[PDB]
From a paper:
Plasminogen activator inhibitor-1 (PAI-1), a member of the serine protease inhibitor (serpin) superfamily, acts by inhibiting tissue-type (tPA) and urokinase-type (uPA) plasminogen activators (PAs). To this end, PAI-1 exposes a flexible reactive center loop (RCL) at its surface, which contains the substrate-mimicking peptide sequence Arg346-Met347 (designated as P1–P1′). In contrast to other serpins, PAI-1 has the unique ability to spontaneously convert into a stable latent form by inserting the RCL segment N-terminal to the P1–P1′ cleavage site (residues 331 to 346, designated as P16-P1) in the core β-sheet A without prior cleavage to become strand 4 (s4A). Structural analysis of PAI-1 crystals soaked with a solution containing TM5484 allowed us to unambiguously identify its binding site similar to the Vn-binding region comprising hE, hF, and s1A.
After crystallization screening of two stabilized active PAI-1 mutants, PAI-1-W175F and PAI-1-N150H-K154T-Q301P-Q319L-M354I (PAI-1-stab), free or in complex with PAI-1 neutralizing nanobodies (Nb42 and Nb64), diffracting crystals were obtained and soaked with the compounds. In the case of the PAI-1-stab crystal, two PAI-1 molecules (chains A and B) were observed of which only one had TM5484 compound bound (chain A). Indeed, in the case of the second PAI-1 molecule (chain B), access to the binding site is restricted due to close crystallographic contacts with a PAI-1 molecule from the neighboring ASU. Comparison of TM5484 in the compound-bound structures shows TM5484 at the crystallographic interface between PAI-1 and Nb64 (in the PAI-1/Nb42/Nb64 crystal), or between two PAI-1 molecules (in the PAI-1-stab crystal). Comparison of the TM5485-bound PAI-1/Nb42/Nb64 and PAI-1-stab structures revealed that the TM5484 molecule bound in two different orientations, hereafter referred to as “orientation 1” and “orientation 2”. In this respect, it is notable that the carboxylic acid interacts with PAI-1 Lys122 (s1A) through the formation of a salt bridge independent of the orientation of TM5484, and with PAI-1 Thr120 (s1A) through an additional hydrogen bond in orientation 2. In orientation 2, the Cl-atom is located 4.3 Å away from the sidechain of Trp139 in hF and 5.4 Å away from the ring centroid in an edge-on geometry, thus resulting in weaker interactions. Additionally, the Cl-atom makes a 3.4 Å van der Waals interaction with the side chain of Ile135 in hF. In orientation 2, however, the neighboring PAI-1-stab molecule forms a π–π stacking interaction and an electrostatic π-anion interaction with the chloroanthranilic acid moiety of TM5484 through Trp86. Furthermore, Lys88 and Val334 engage in hydrophobic interactions (π-alkyl and amide-π stacking, and π-sigma, respectively) with the phenylfuran moiety of TM5484.
Numbering used by the authors: 2 to 335, 339 to 342, 348 to 379
The structure:
Amino acid sequence: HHPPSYVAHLASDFGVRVFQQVAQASKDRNVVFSPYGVASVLAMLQLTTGGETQQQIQAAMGFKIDDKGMAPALRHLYKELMGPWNKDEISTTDAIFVQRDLKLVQGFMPHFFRLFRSTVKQVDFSEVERARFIINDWVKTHTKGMISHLLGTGAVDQLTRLVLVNALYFNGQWKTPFPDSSTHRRLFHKSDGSTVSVPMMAQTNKFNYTEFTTPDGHYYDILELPYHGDTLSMFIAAPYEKEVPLSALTNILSAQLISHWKGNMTRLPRLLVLPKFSLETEVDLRKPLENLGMTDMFRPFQADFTSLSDQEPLHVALALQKVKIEVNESGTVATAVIAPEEIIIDRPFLFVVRHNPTGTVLFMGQVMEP
Ligand SMILES: O=C(Nc1cccc(-c2ccoc2)c1)C(=O)Nc1ccc(Cl)cc1C(=O)O
């Protein structure tokens, strides 16, 4: 079962469904994504919407941001996730940018700040280069410089009126780092049958482990790798057989399934071999969100943003997420156990970064080639 945090389940379930749309349109390429991040910035966007645009977002997310206690619970979740100290291992930021001289509904801006403790950001898009710089500089200054540019800002021009962005960086310190000395080159088998020699880490430990089956009965392994805070973990999932494609797993993912993986795990002594990886993804959220039914928000004269402004037309010109994640021997900072059963992750695999106290799915991705 999920831990008791209802808003974490809501955010994660919606974010995982968005990820599935991204992965389906990216069949055999690397993707990293943040379910929590997309849910957080669309929860904020809910407050700007009205009419059928609002109904589409609320239906797809499964809640209304204005409902009693919902925004405070999201603010409490944010604090629980981001409050604890970390070794510059994680950074996130959300931003909604709106044309500076649009007449805003009276009371909107204070109401947004009351619910979210952050502001919608007014920008003059007629000064195209300055607007592009402001958006990129916001992301650079709120990710500690780890993400400094969105390529999607190349679409910002003098006609832009409403932009949303979410950017996250993650590079966590394992509870038990992999020994530097055990890293080594090993063949990785790609989905097309070709191979590539890549650096892989290795360590022997007692790992939380479970074996599940897909609805077609293919076995797959799931391992938990805890981070040092004892609160975050990375789950690694891959089919046992090389001939089973990773889509067999991504097509059935859900927040509920991930909680079931964790509930069924026991700790087994194993030699784990895992590729290092450093992935960055920037995704235009329009098509994934349209596929979940949020079509009006992207269409001029159909989008309804009347809680934010009565000016027409007004629609989302740009909705971007950019995530950068590093998996290495010990995260952001600098002994081998010397024969047990081995689990060798030498084919495409899924990863999930999960906050265990709440169930929050912070990151998710598919490594098709490290
Ligand atoms: O704050 C704003 N506009 C505003 C207008 C009317 C009322 C209120 C308000 C807030 C609470 O109560 C009333 C805010 C704003 O444009 N900010 C920003 C713009 C650009 C950038 Cl790059 C950053 C920010 C920021 O804020 O970091």
